[PDB]
Amino acid sequence: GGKTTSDDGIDLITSFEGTRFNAYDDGVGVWTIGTGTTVYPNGVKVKKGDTCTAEQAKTYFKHDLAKFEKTVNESVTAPLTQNQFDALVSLTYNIGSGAFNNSTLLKKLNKGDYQGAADQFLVWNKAGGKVMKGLVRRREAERALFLKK
């Protein structure tokens, strides 16, 4: 939109998401495949037993990535570094657009309060309503990227 996710950003998100050939349970029962895909671009939901090629996974990932880029570009009104944009997209890829849009993160960010926004990454550590240690790690990493310059 304004910005797009950098190659480094994509590599980070991919490291968090993984790239899987077989549909798998994300931990809370949501069948996921490729690089974090749960809904194919045609609207079909991922199901247990699906398989996905590398090329398919890339297509699906890039399709969803563009959605989240659009959210960050449109919803954030404060200036962003590329690192900040990348971090916010990584977060949004996980929490979704609605969660991002209604977050205290975004409220602080749009006041120009970068530090307060950075710290708000850390609240997004839940899956299935439960704190998940992989998300705790991920949020810390996204926050670090957000603060990196």
Numbering used by the authors: 48 to 196
Which statements did the authors publish about this structure?
During an analysis of Acinetobacter baumannii strain AB 5075 genome we have identified an open reading frame (ORF) encoding a protein with the proposed muramidase activity that structurally resembles bacteriophage endolysins.
The crystal structure of AcLys was refined to 1.2 Å resolution. The protein has overall α-helical architecture typical for lysozyme family, and is composed of seven α-helices: α2: residues 54–64, α3: 101–122, α4: 129–142, α5: 144–149, α6: 151–157, α7: 161–170 and α8: 180–193. Active site is formed by conserved catalytic triad: Glu64, Asp73 and Thr79 are clearly seen in the electron density. This salt bridge is a well-known feature of the known endolysins of P21 and P22 families. In case of AcLys the loop harbors an increased number of positively charged residues, including conserved Arg185, Arg186, Arg190 and Lys180 (also found in case of DLP12 endolysin from E. coli), unique Arg184—which is a part of positively charged patch consisting of three arginines, as well as Lys195 and Lys196.
